[PDB]
Design an enzyme around this catalytic site. Structure first.
Site, PDB file in Angstrom:
ATOM      1  N   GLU A  73      48.891 -45.997 -32.258  1.00 23.08           N
ATOM      2  CA  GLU A  73      47.616 -45.293 -32.117  1.00 23.08           C
ATOM      3  C   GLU A  73      46.530 -45.821 -33.039  1.00 23.08           C
ATOM      4  OE1 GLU A  73      48.689 -41.065 -32.319  1.00 23.08           O
ATOM      5  OE2 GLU A  73      49.623 -41.183 -30.341  1.00 23.08           O
ATOM      6  N   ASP A 124      55.653 -36.898 -26.456  1.00 30.85           N
ATOM      7  CA  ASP A 124      54.858 -36.384 -27.573  1.00 30.85           C
ATOM      8  C   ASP A 124      54.896 -34.851 -27.677  1.00 30.85           C
ATOM      9  OD1 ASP A 124      53.133 -36.346 -29.715  1.00 30.85           O
ATOM     10  OD2 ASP A 124      51.322 -36.518 -28.550  1.00 30.85           O
ATOM     11  N   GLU A 143      50.348 -27.604 -31.380  1.00 28.88           N
ATOM     12  CA  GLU A 143      49.423 -28.550 -30.747  1.00 28.88           C
ATOM     13  C   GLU A 143      49.439 -28.439 -29.234  1.00 28.88           C
ATOM     14  OE1 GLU A 143      50.013 -32.707 -31.669  1.00 28.88           O
ATOM     15  OE2 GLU A 143      48.318 -33.287 -30.386  1.00 28.88           O
TER      16      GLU A 143
HETATM   17  O1  LIG Z   1      52.751 -37.837 -34.201  1.00 25.97           O
HETATM   18  C1  LIG Z   1      51.698 -38.492 -34.330  1.00 25.97           C
HETATM   19  O2  LIG Z   1      51.565 -39.479 -35.054  1.00 25.97           O
HETATM   20  C2  LIG Z   1      50.488 -38.093 -33.488  1.00 25.97           C
HETATM   21  O3  LIG Z   1      51.075 -37.288 -32.501  1.00 25.97           O
HETATM   22  C3  LIG Z   1      50.247 -36.701 -31.551  1.00 25.97           C
HETATM   23  O4  LIG Z   1      51.036 -35.623 -31.059  1.00 25.97           O
HETATM   24  C4  LIG Z   1      49.061 -35.991 -32.199  1.00 25.97           C
HETATM   25  O5  LIG Z   1      48.186 -35.645 -31.140  1.00 25.97           O
HETATM   26  C5  LIG Z   1      48.380 -36.827 -33.265  1.00 25.97           C
HETATM   27  O6  LIG Z   1      47.451 -35.988 -33.931  1.00 25.97           O
HETATM   28  C6  LIG Z   1      49.451 -37.292 -34.245  1.00 25.97           C
HETATM   29  O7  LIG Z   1      48.907 -38.119 -35.237  1.00 25.97           O
END
Ligand SMILES: O=C(O)[C@H]1O[C@@H](O)[C@H](O)[C@@H](O)[C@@H]1O
Ligand SMILES: O=C(O)[C@H]1O[C@@H](O)[C@H](O)[C@@H](O)[C@@H]1O
Ligand SMILES: [Co+2]
Ligand SMILES: [Co+2]
Ligand SMILES: [Co+2]
Ligand SMILES: [Co+2]
Ligand SMILES: [Co+2]
Ligand SMILES: [Co+2]
Ligand SMILES: [Co+2]
Ligand SMILES: [Co+2]
Lengths: 708, 708
Positions: free
Chosen positions: B288, B361, B389
């Site tokens: 990411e 996720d 979340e």
């Molecule tokens: O786990 C993670 O690194 C990422 O995972 C996703 O679920 C989230 O949306 C993000 O904010 C986190 O940084």
């Protein structure tokens, strides 16, 4: 003690003799009325008296008993009416009250009497305050009415709940759960403000989000308004002038366009359908990129009046801010006066011009805003800052009482002697109709509301002074300390004095002698007197101090920007003559050589250094003072203030060192040998300015990853 | 009840008969030890027993009295050593304990015995838990030891104090007052986690800020470590792989470069000088946009081992996250497995691969991460999400116990039957060196720590399951309800069942039958199943559901992406056959025509509609259940949960209507007449998605001014 109750700590009176006296005087609580406001007053007295007197006191409507506290108006309490108060009640008006030890059919009573229910509420809080501060009730006879009509707080809250210049947590308004969840805290917030007689709140940021005017948010805002209503607090909102466009309803926001006029009229109808007693609008327009009438080639009277016409049928008012200054003018100091003076008399009667205490931006010391002494046909109100944007966020101790008092008692000579800012605000000088004072408090979800325990005292003083602008900083501090911490005389005196010097200390280690705007931009936590090269010169530091090898200061006399001519002649004369200008304002108006000799005998360079070092010594002295109070304060708050003062001392040294070394690099003069020489150079403090954590969620600097 | 104490509510036992029994059994508290950890245990028992037993119980080291609670190890309490517990006690290891009613020198006692001081602390909390949950002490003889080594919480906190996926306020860490101010809350945070046996915390965001490794922050972090230490909680930090470059010390972060290796060795030395028992690093790398070894053409093993070598001499560990997926692969589901399986066996023994429960996720339901059953030569640990979340921020009630339990008891067949996720994590399947589980809790400064009172239950269950992965959601819930609300049986049963259904309700109104990733991007509050055209297809909704006029689902069998081949044969077989694949996972693996008939008799379209509507009905039933509990809960918390449930119902309806109407628009099939037709059309729900306030300070959507 976690600070959640602030100054409304209803704990048993520590003085046992005094406690017995109160117990003999108040044995019952008589409340005949049953309106929401009277009920809130009853509830407050019930919890308050029960706590302070250490015995169950319950509000009842029963045949009068000996040694009662009796509250009400002649309209809602026959017992109050039977006293035939007459002219005595007449002078109290719509928000005043009378507190009096007296007799009703041979029964001993203390009365809280007023013409209105809100007056009874304010009076009930004062009655409690007398006990909280250990004042005697025997022979009590006092009356009070507020001197200003609109006594409001302002919250620079964004809808995401991050507060701009907010060092006390997230915004109190939990939009995700509103309107469904009527949190107790909303009521506590109302209690806190009503205890000071505060009767209005603007809940959202002046850098305004148009969403607050949408149905979605009005339903939420109405729930808040419902919670605030019994406590006499009216709801107000900051508005975005471009709202008609933001909603996608009109392709312009020009106030002279009939479609725009209609949009605001229809929006006001919508707001009032939700909140029938809605207060009105706060407006930041044509300032710092916020939209406004000048964006459509119109003036601020045209803009304000268009909004005022939409609110008029509903009794609403427009608080139009004078915080306006264009980048291309010669001198920012001149800004607001030159913008608004040509408009004097052009504003509708339900428009009030909201003016900051000084012409720049809430700096530690500023001369009074010339607008206060120049606008004679326009309603005005004061805007003070409580949140410590410029006094050290939540880590520095800085009671703002003395800044407010200094402002309010400042003689302007606008119309003879006695033309003080407070008298101007009261409306007696220029004879205006709507008066007020607004306080940017920016509290948040932190348990103690304000982050730093002592920010509470600034909120406290603000509200007391909005009620009576002649109340001193000392008086307010005395009350606050007694209510918040202790009634021990040995505690009160040195802590009060410590509070009273804190403001001046904050001037001294940042920008004494008329210096100003030396902050890191735009976060404002630490020193950055070298700041230059920003998109606008008037955002920098050098623009204000103009320091050079030969001197320092900004010429605002007839030979400079001539901003002194914006003031009444006696003020222009006193400040324009080196023999009479106060040294605490000198560099606001004069560019002086470093060899100019000050009252103390020091040259200006030496005096500059002396003041900066003095500020740090004042903090160190506050530290010692605080340490001597350990026996009088609960362990938790004691430890917390002790630690914060250590952070403050560290930061004050950084401020002192950064500024003194910077101005040294420009003047080329040595720091006198008796002072502790900084061990590091100017570059080191520049490095610290780039890397020292900025403790505020809102400003981007707190997210800065610069490490060199 | 404002929720500050969470489940550590030490209020007098309500059952008077039971209370008397406890009072007769525990009359004194005997503590011979005096280490910080023992002192912490003593303090907890003192406050806990005194509160629960409604009498003053003070920890003392005195000649043993009859009816005492005696705590300690053989090393620090001669009374405990005299019992010669031997092998029985020794088998409980470095964190286990024995709770037993017995006799010492003819005195009646109950012991809390362990091999280590932290074992005494854990045992002390369990002793309190027996009392809080009204369990009998007569004939007590129970022992416990944790089944995983590293039982850790993760906080995705940014240094500005805004929490990423944080619905419970600002970050607990007050960097502006640290290290000077050791806030009581730091100790209460440690008490909360120690009560569950949690022995580690990662305090900062995985999207990591390099400043946490600077001296400025290490001083602050060390004060937190100091406060956590006596409670057995080690400090860990998330790290930014590019740190050597961010500090300006090296022009690369390539782990094969000697200067990089040296930078991390030196940094580790600096960390350990501040925190001598520092736990180690959490790492989000090459994911990411976060930097990592792949940015230098290296692989995750070379990156991890480099960090591991730096931590090894100090006994630190690297929690290397497996949450990695490149935009360019064909199926995101395959990502982690395809990235890490080639590296199995190449990681150093102090590297633990931290893997989310599923391969996408944290979605309301996901099949287990294939890595858990595939990696046989690498230390692994589980990562669960507690912060909601994907379950509705702080406004939806969603006990996560059933998700955690479902995961932990899932049979993977990795080495035949008995290869549950829990057993894999414990080290019973593959022989491994380091075990554990991490939970993303993201609490904040809100008074109740979690925003929604029921998020507390999820943190509770997480901790309990980290201790013993076979503990059911039901058990945890029973315990949590007793400690937090009430021991009344008529309350416990229906509220436990409500809790137990809330997870599934959350699946049903969002994405049932194996649907997934239907959220508004990137805020994740509300529905957006139409989401398409983002910079990467794997961030959209259409990517996952592949809905068309003919069908829905994602083919992951041999004829599709063949992600099923990443699982052990028995799993691939069960899930790849339409006759055996669980319906609650079906669309993860199969693209099916709308006419396919489900077990219920309905075709796939009908079943889809039925589940979405069931979810809303489940929330409505939760509302009804909660309303029936008014007599058993305090007025404030009752009102709060009641109001939140109303918000949740409203949002569940919005979720249901938005998804059903969207899938209808694609399938072209009617909603059966026995289902209430949505209040409005699909475009209206698209409008609501753009305009409905997103209640989270962190994500930019909460600042969106879109009004159409
Ligand atoms: O786990 C993670 O690194 C990422 O995972 C996703 O679920 C989230 O949306 C993000 O904010 C986190 O940084
Ligand atoms: O008063 C105002 O409008 C502005 O004033 C300045 O003091 C603040 O830096 C800014 O955040 C406010 O928005
Ligand atoms: Co406080
Ligand atoms: Co913001
Ligand atoms: Co002092
Ligand atoms: Co000199
Ligand atoms: Co709670
Ligand atoms: Co952020
Ligand atoms: Co239910
Ligand atoms: Co059909």
């Amino acid at each position: 003690e976690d600070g959640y109750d602030m100054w409304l700590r209803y704990q048993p009176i520590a003085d046992q003799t005094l406690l017995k006296t109160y117990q003999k005087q108040i044995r019952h609580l008589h409340v005949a009325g049953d309106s929401p406001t009277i009920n809130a007053a009853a509830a407050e007295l019930q919890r308050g008296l029960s706590g302070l007197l250490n015995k169950p006191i319950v509000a009842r409507d029963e045949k009068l008993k000996d040694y009662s506290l009796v509250i009400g108006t002649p309209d809602n309490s026959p017992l109050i009416a039977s006293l035939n108060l007459g002219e005595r009640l007449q002078a109290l008006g719509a928000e005043g009250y009378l507190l009096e030890q007296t007799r009703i059919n041979k029964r001993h009573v203390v009365i809280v009497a007023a013409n209105s229910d809100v007056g009874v509420l304010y009076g009930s809080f004062h009655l409690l305050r007398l006990i909280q501060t250990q004042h005697a009730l025997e022979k009590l006879s006092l009356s009070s009415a507020p001197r200003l009509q609109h006594r409001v707080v302002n919250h620079w809250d964004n809808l995401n709940r991050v507060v701009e210049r907010g060092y006390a947590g997230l915004s109190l308004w939990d939009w995700g759960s509103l309107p469904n969840y009527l949190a107790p805290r909303y009521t506590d917030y109302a209690r806190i403000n009503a205890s000071l007689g505060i009767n209005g709140t603007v809940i959202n940021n002046v850098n305004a989000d148009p969403r607050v005017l949408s149905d979605q948010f009005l339903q939420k805002i109405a729930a808040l308004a419902d919670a605030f209503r019994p406590y006499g607090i009216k709801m107000y909102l900051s508005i975005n002038f471009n709202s008609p466009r933001a909603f996608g309803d009109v392709d312009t926001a020009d106030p002279l366009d009939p479609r725009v006029q209609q949009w605001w009229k229809t929006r006001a109808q919508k707001i009032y359908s939700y909140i029938p007693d809605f207060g009105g609008f706060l407006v930041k327009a044509d300032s710092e990129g916020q939209p406004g009438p000048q964006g459509y080639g119109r003036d601020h009277a045209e803009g304000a009046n268009m909004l005022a016409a939409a609110l008029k049928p509903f009794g609403g008012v427009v608080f139009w801010r004078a915080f306006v200054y264009h980048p291309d003018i010669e001198d920012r100091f001149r800004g607001a006066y030159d913008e608004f003076m040509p408009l004097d008399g052009k504003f509708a009667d339900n428009v009030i011009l909201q003016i900051k205490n000084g012409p720049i931006d809430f700096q530690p010391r500023e001369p009074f805003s010339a607008l206060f002494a120049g606008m004679s046909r326009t309603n005005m109100m004061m805007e003070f800052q409580i949140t410590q944007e410029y006094f050290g966020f939540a880590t520095h101790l800085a009671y703002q009482g003395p800044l407010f008092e200094e402002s309010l008692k400042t003689e302007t000579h606008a119309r003879g002697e006695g033309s003080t800012i407070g008298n101007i605000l009261e409306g007696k000088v220029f004879k205006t109709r709507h008066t007020g004072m607004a306080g940017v408090i920016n509290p948040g979800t932190d348990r103690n509301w304000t982050g730093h325990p002592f920010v509470q005292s600034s909120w406290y003083a603000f509200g007391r002074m909005a009620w009576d602008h002649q109340i001193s900083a000392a008086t307010a501090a005395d009350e606050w300390l007694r209510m918040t911490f202790s009634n021990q005389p040995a505690f009160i005196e040195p802590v009060k004095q410590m509070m009273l010097v804190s403001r001046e200390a904050g001037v001294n280690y940042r920008s004494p002698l008329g210096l100003t705007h030396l902050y890191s931009q735009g976060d404002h936590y630490g020193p950055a007197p070298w700041t230059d090269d920003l998109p606008r010169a008037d955002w920098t530091a050098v623009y204000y101090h103009r320091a050079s090898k030969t001197g320092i200061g900004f010429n605002r006399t007839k030979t400079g920007s001539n901003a002194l001519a914006q003031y009444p002649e006696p003020i222009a004369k006193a400040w324009g003559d080196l023999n009479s200008v106060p040294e605490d304002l000198i560099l606001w108006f004069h560019h002086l050589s470093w060899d100019h000799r000050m009252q103390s005998g020091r040259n200006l360079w030496q005096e500059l250094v002396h003041k900066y070092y003095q500020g740090v010594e004042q903090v160190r002295a506050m530290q010692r003072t605080w340490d001597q109070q350990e026996a009088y304060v609960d362990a938790a708050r004691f430890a917390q203030v002790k630690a914060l003062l250590q952070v403050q001392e560290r930061e004050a040294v950084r401020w002192r060192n950064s500024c003194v070394l910077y101005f040294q690099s420009v003047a080329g003069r040595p720091i006198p040998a008796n002072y502790e020489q900084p061990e590091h150079d100017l570059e080191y403090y520049k490095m610290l300015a780039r890397t020292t954590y900025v403790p505020e969620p809102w400003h981007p600097a707190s997210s800065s990853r610069v490490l060199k």
